[PDB]
Amino acid sequence: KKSARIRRATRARRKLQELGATRLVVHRTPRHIYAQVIAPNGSEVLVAASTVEKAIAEQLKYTGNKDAAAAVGKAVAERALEKGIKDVSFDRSGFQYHGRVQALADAAREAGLQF
Amino acid sequence: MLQPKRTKFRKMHKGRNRGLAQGTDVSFGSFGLKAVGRGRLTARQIEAARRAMTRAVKRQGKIWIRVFPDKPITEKPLAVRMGKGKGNVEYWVALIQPGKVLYEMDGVPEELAREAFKLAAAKLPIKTTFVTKTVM
Amino acid sequence: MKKDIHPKYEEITASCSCGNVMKIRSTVGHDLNLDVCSKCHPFFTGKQRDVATGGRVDRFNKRFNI
Amino acid sequence: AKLHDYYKDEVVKKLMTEFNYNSVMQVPRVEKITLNMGVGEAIADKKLLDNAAADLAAISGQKPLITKARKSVAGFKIRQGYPIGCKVTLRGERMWEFFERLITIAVPRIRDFRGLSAKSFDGRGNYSMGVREQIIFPEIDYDKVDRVRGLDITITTTAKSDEEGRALLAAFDFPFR
Amino acid sequence: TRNGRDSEAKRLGVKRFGGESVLAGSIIVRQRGTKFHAGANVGCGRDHTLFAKADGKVKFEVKGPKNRKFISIEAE
Amino acid sequence: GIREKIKLVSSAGTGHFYTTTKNKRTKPEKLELKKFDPVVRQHVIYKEAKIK
RNA sequence: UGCCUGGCGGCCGUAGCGCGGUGGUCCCACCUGACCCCAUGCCGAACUCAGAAGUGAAACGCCGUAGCGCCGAUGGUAGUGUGGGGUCUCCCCAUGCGAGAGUAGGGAACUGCCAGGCAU
RNA sequence: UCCUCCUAAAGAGUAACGGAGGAGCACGAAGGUUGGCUAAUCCUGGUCGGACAUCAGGAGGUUAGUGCAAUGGCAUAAGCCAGCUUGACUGCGAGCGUGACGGCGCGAGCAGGUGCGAAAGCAGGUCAUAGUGAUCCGGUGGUUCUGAAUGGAAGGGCCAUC
RNA sequence: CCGACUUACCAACCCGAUGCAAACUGCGAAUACCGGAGAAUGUUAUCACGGGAGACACACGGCGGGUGCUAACGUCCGUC
Numbered sequence A: 001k002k003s004a005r006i007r008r009a010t011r012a013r014r015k016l017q018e019l020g021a022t023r024l025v026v027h028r029t030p031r032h033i034y035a036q037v038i039a040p041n042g043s044e045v046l047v048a049a050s051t052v053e054k055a056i057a058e059q060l061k062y063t064g065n066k067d068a069a070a071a072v073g074k075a076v077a078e079r080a081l082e083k084g085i086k087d088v089s090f091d092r093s094g095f096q097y098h099g100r101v102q103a104l105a106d107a108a109r110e111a112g113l114q115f
Numbered sequence B: 001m002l003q004p005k006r007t008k009f010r011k012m013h014k015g016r017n018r019g020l021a022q023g024t025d026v027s028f029g030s031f032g033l034k035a036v037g038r039g040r041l042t043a044r045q046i047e048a049a050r051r052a053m054t055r056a057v058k059r060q061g062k063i064w065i066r067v068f069p070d071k072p073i074t075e076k077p078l079a080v081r082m083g084k085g086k087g088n089v090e091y092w093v094a095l096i097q098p099g100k101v102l103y104e105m106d107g108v109p110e111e112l113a114r115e116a117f118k119l120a121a122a123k124l125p126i127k128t129t130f131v132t133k134t135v136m
Numbered sequence C: 001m002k003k004d005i006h007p008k009y010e011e012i013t014a015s016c017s018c019g020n021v022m023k024i025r026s027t028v029g030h031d032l033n034l035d036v037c038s039k040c041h042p043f044f045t046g047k048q049r050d051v052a053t054g055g056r057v058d059r060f061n062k063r064f065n066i
Numbered sequence D: 001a002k003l004h005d006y007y008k009d010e011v012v013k014k015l016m017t018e019f020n021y022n023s024v025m026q027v028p029r030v031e032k033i034t035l036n037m038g039v040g041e042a043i044a045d046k047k048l049l050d051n052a053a054a055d056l057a058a059i060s061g062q063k064p065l066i067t068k069a070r071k072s073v074a075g076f077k078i079r080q081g082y083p084i085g086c087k088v089t090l091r092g093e094r095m096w097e098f099f100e101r102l103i104t105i106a107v108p109r110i111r112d113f114r115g116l117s118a119k120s121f122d123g124r125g126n127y128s129m130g131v132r133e134q135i136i137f138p139e140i141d142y143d144k145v146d147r148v149r150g151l152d153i154t155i156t157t158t159a160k161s162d163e164e165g166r167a168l169l170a171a172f173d174f175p176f177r
Numbered sequence E: 001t002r003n004g005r006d007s008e009a010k011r012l013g014v015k016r017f018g019g020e021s022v023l024a025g026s027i028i029v030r031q032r033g034t035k036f037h038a039g040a041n042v043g044c045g046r047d048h049t050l051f052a053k054a055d056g057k058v059k060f061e062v063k064g065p066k067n068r069k070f071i072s073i074e075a076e
Numbered sequence F: 001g002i003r004e005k006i007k008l009v010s011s012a013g014t015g016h017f018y019t020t021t022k023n024k025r026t027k028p029e030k031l032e033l034k035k036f037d038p039v040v041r042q043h044v045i046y047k048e049a050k051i052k
Numbered sequence G: 001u002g003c004c005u006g007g008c009g010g011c012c013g014u015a016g017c018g019c020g021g022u023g024g025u026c027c028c029a030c031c032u033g034a035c036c037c038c039a040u041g042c043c044g045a046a047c048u049c050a051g052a053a054g055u056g057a058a059a060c061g062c063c064g065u066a067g068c069g070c071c072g073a074u075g076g077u078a079g080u081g082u083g084g085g086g087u088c089u090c091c092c093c094a095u096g097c098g099a100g101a102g103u104a105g106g107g108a109a110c111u112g113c114c115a116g117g118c119a120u
Numbered sequence H: 001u002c003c004u005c006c007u008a009a010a011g012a013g014u015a016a017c018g019g020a021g022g023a024g025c026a027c028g029a030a031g032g033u034u035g036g037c038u039a040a041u042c043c044u045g046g047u048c049g050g051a052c053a054u055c056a057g058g059a060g061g062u063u064a065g066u067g068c069a070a071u072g073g074c075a076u077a078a079g080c081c082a083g084c085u086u087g088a089c090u091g092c093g094a095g096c097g098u099g100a101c102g103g104c105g106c107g108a109g110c111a112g113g114u115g116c117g118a119a120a121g122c123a124g125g126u127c128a129u130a131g132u133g134a135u136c137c138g139g140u141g142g143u144u145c146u147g148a149a150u151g152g153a154a155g156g157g158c159c160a161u162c
Numbered sequence I: 001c002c003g004a005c006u007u008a009c010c011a012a013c014c015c016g017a018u019g020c021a022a023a024c025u026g027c028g029a030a031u032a033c034c035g036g037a038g039a040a041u042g043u044u045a046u047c048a049c050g051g052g053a054g055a056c057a058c059a060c061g062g063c064g065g066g067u068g069c070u071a072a073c074g075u076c077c078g079u080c
């Protein structure tokens, strides 16, 4: 079940590489969750909002669920716009837009993002 | 005799006949007869030499042929004016470039093999001479 | 599992005449008995019975003697 | 769920002892039960397809798959896309509640039953088996079968060898031989 | 009889070779398949023509993990 | 072949028509495509008629 | 700073298969459980959610690994522009450019923005 | 007359009564988009099931497929499934490749209306290369452009079409 | 119903080894060709539009070739 994420994502991530817009990378793990942004070259990331940094996850009850995904989706906007990252495009990373990603990609829009 | 059981397409071009050989050395047995000149070997001549050399070996030992004719030579039929197409395949020819081996032999000793290869040399259009088994 | 297009499933008693009370859900509806119970079935006590070969000396000396 | 209440508590107590294992992962586990009752004769009536898509659906409570012919054969009057097969797949707890109805009732009920032979594991422990008739699952009315045509139960499991996958089923006194 | 026909090809190949400077809208390679792939700032057309979008110098760049020919456009 | 010419007439009341080709044999039921119209500028149903 | 582990990169088989060990505190997989959130052309197998009793077995990275694949010499080979010939159906000469296959060898990746854990 | 490889001499092009093959159609989806999936073949086990139906793993890894000939492509699949749709759009086009011209084809960016998708984005027919035909004359439906004294009408142009 | 029998028999899988190719390349030179930067060079020698005709039947010598038999002071080509 490892290769399915890579194979579904190598369309949209290569299409974002061909575009040149700044990419919003999501991750759907059962226990934890990652989210970050990345320059148009693909090797110099800027922010990192997750639940392995315990400083944000200590004020949240669980890590991998419907409300904590929204918490990390706010916590990436409120450390990305503070450095001033306005131009952004989102990679769904194969895990489809229902539930976790459905809350993460709109808690950012409630917390001020532009995509 | 030898002939291809199948060609992909029917009639091939002539080409040319440049280059040295590839199957240079004795590869299987002990004794060899090797071409020197430049030319063309048909389907009939090599099996005629096969009978003319088997008749001297007297069903002893073993002999190997490596060359196998596959060039679809043609003819234009007699008393037909030169146009109106190509011709139909009449026989099948092999190409022999200078240095290529034809047959190899084992078992039967070398002094018999002198005249036993000389008889099959005398029915062949290009000059050949004997070679031995080389240990590397 | 789709919510509609699969049939009924309700618990029903399946007792055997040798006394194996059991419950299983199915679609059969009515109380369904059992004839053959595999807690005393003739597979581990009752498949010797067929072989019936016999020594021919035994079939000889069962009917008379010398 | 009764046999699975038996399994996790009183099969590992043998399959941990007799085979020198470290973890609870090394023991084999059942994976799925598949029920193919194929009708290769449905070209003369569509009813013989759909009745064979209902007569095994009434056994185990799922609507089944009308699976199609994969490639084409000129001989047996088939092409790409003829619905000929019927398949049910069961996983989890419904697998156990069908395995109960097999091994407690429908295994001795078959006519001239003399066990089920000890080599059907295809070298990897994944089982295969085949009945000859339908009424031996006792969930049918007697004179309400149009024809007689068996199916073949296949117990796909996470067995790894023929020596080491058989003992799982033999721990439920599978009537071998 | 059996051997009468042929058809002249559509004059294909590389048109603006690798190294020099091209405009926008012109064609680099008119080709059959995706023989020279979707390089930087070129479009592959309906019949897989390689046409530039920007201006400037072309450059024939090997790239990719399966050794594919990409045809690039950068600003001169 | 028997794909013959047919005329898609605009249903906006204006006199506009496309021309396409349909198969009368395998699909003999009539055709309603919601196509663009240049004169009324809105996408309008196209009720079908003959090519004459 | 050091080591390990997680998404993304440069890289295009010296970077991949082989067989034998490995590491689960944290991370990752398995897993646990499932009614509304979604899910199957049958089915919690895939897909989604809720949670962490149990295991690092299978996956997943490391070291060991010349059975490979792969890279790769120097030297020799016929080809070959241009010019003179010959025993002109094809080869020799003076000049450069001189590769494929094989010999000696290398060879179990390397590296970068990033976050956590343990140590110094 | 057109289409595919080779002869054709590593760019285009290059002939003969030279060597081999296909076309003069189709498709209301076999189209646009979203989401998802991955083969041919043999081994082994299995109800009638046989060497070849369907079902199970398992080896192997495009040796398979494209509505059709080859050739070149193809995993992000351009191959195969489900949902919604009519962009199989209207006016345009910088700039090009190739013909002697009559041509033919690709085409970023714009306007006006949309479809898909949460979103960037994609879409001006089908993986591309064959599915073909100048002019005159003549028919259909619009068109206030003209209307041989004036208002009209016949007829002619105009764009769509046969 | 079965089956032990090898038997100068052939034969796909695969293996160590050997060749050939216009219609198949896991490799692949020279020379030839498009475009920029430059040194010396030649009677602008390179295109542009404008006036006027010629020609549209070619052969042989060397090289890479296709009909022909690697025959023809033979034929059909690209090239000097």
Ligand SMILES: [Mg+2]
Pocket (backbone or CB within 6 Å): B018, B019, B020, B097
């Ligand atoms: Mg040769």
Ligand SMILES: [Mg+2]
Pocket (backbone or CB within 6 Å): G020, G021
């Ligand atoms: Mg190991």
Ligand SMILES: [Mg+2]
Pocket (backbone or CB within 6 Å): none
């Ligand atoms: Mg291991």
Ligand SMILES: [Mg+2]
Pocket (backbone or CB within 6 Å): none
């Ligand atoms: Mg699972």
Ligand SMILES: [Mg+2]
Pocket (backbone or CB within 6 Å): G077, G099
């Ligand atoms: Mg060399």
Ligand SMILES: [Mg+2]
Pocket (backbone or CB within 6 Å): none
């Ligand atoms: Mg080399």
Ligand SMILES: [Mg+2]
Pocket (backbone or CB within 6 Å): G014, G107, G108
């Ligand atoms: Mg290596």
Ligand SMILES: [Mg+2]
Pocket (backbone or CB within 6 Å): G108
């Ligand atoms: Mg290794």
Ligand SMILES: [Mg+2]
Pocket (backbone or CB within 6 Å): none
């Ligand atoms: Mg050429």
Ligand SMILES: [Mg+2]
Pocket (backbone or CB within 6 Å): H030
């Ligand atoms: Mg189609």
Ligand SMILES: [Mg+2]
Pocket (backbone or CB within 6 Å): none
């Ligand atoms: Mg079989």
Ligand SMILES: [Mg+2]
Pocket (backbone or CB within 6 Å): none
């Ligand atoms: Mg697609």
Ligand SMILES: [Mg+2]
Pocket (backbone or CB within 6 Å): none
């Ligand atoms: Mg299609």
Ligand SMILES: [Mg+2]
Pocket (backbone or CB within 6 Å): none
């Ligand atoms: Mg097509």
Ligand SMILES: [Mg+2]
Pocket (backbone or CB within 6 Å): none
């Ligand atoms: Mg007027």
Ligand SMILES: [Mg+2]
Pocket (backbone or CB within 6 Å): H147
């Ligand atoms: Mg008037």
